[PDB]
Amino acid sequence: HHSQDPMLSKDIIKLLNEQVNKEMNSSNLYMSMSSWCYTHSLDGAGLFLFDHAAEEYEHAKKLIIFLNENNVPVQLTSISAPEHKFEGLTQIFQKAYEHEQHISESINNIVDHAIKSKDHATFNFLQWYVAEQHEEEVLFKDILDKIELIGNENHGLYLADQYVKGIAKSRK
């Protein structure tokens, strides 16, 4: 039997498939960072990062749903192993914020390509993703700001972890 051709252009198909991969890779990076925190007495940051990991996977799933509805094959390649060696809480959040900046850039790139190719169905679909990613990037900026304001001396790590724990619980 004949099935209809993919409804998206080759370039958009490529970018969206790559984005699914990026989000799956992100989820595993955040699981790794979360585990580091849990095994170093930082269960507040552990919980926050675990829940964020799960959210990145939810983004991957929403992208997959869009590809499916457009008859676009989801061609999954490998998901690269995440970074696992970390120096401390500050470094983890520095790396996390940098990572979120990279993800924001990748989304801007897809949206820009959608505009150039006049693919406004894709442009329109991506708006929840733009908005949610901005909130996530701002959140990591804010947490990093707070970690650096507190520092790691004189119960600093404890205070920072409890701060992050509060955020984790409030977002549930």
In the complex, the smallest distance separating the C-beta of residue 56 from Fe ion, rounded to whole angstroms, is: 5
Hey, how many other C-beta atoms are within 10 angstroms of the C-beta on 123? 17
In the complex, the smallest distance separating the C-beta of residue 40 from Fe ion, rounded to whole angstroms, is: 20
Q: Is 100 annotated as a binding residue?
A: yes
Q: Shortest CA distance to 104 belongs to which of 70, 82, 129? A: 129
- 58: amino acid identity, one letter: E
Identity of the residue, 69 or 87, whose beta carbon is nearer to its own copies in the bound complex:
69
Per-residue 3-state assignment (H helix, E strand, C coil) for 34-71: HHHHHCCCCHHHHHHHHHHHHHHHHHHHHHHHHHHHCC
In the complex, the smallest distance separating the C-beta of residue 25 from Fe ion, rounded to whole angstroms, is: 11
Task: Pick one of its own copies, Fe ion, none as the site partner of residue 40 (Cβ within 5 to 8 A by kind).
Answer: its own copies
Identity of the residue, 87 or 145, whose beta carbon is nearer to its own copies in the bound complex:
145
Task: Pick one of Fe ion, its own copies, none as the site partner of residue 136 (Cβ within 5 to 8 A by kind).
Answer: Fe ion
Name the one residue in this structure whose structure tokens are 């470094």.
91
| Helix spans in 5-42 (H) | 10-38
Report the interface residues with Fe ion, using CB under 5 A: 59, 103, 133, 136
Q: Shortest CA distance to 129 belongs to which of 84, 65, 76, 85? A: 65
Task: Pick one of its own copies, Fe ion, none as the site partner of residue 13 (Cβ within 5 to 8 A by kind).
Answer: none
Q: Is 78 exposed, middle or buried (0-12, 13-18, 19+ CB in 10 A)?
A: exposed
Identity of the residue, 125 or 168, whose beta carbon is nearer to its own copies in the bound complex:
125
In the complex, the smallest distance separating the C-beta of residue 99 from its own copies, rounded to whole angstroms, is: 14
Q: Is 133 annotated as a binding residue?
A: yes
61's tokens: 């799933």
Identity of the residue, 120 or 171, whose beta carbon is nearer to its own copies in the bound complex:
120
The number of residues in the chain equals 172
Task: Tell me the binding residues for Fe cation.
Answer: 23, 56, 59, 100, 133
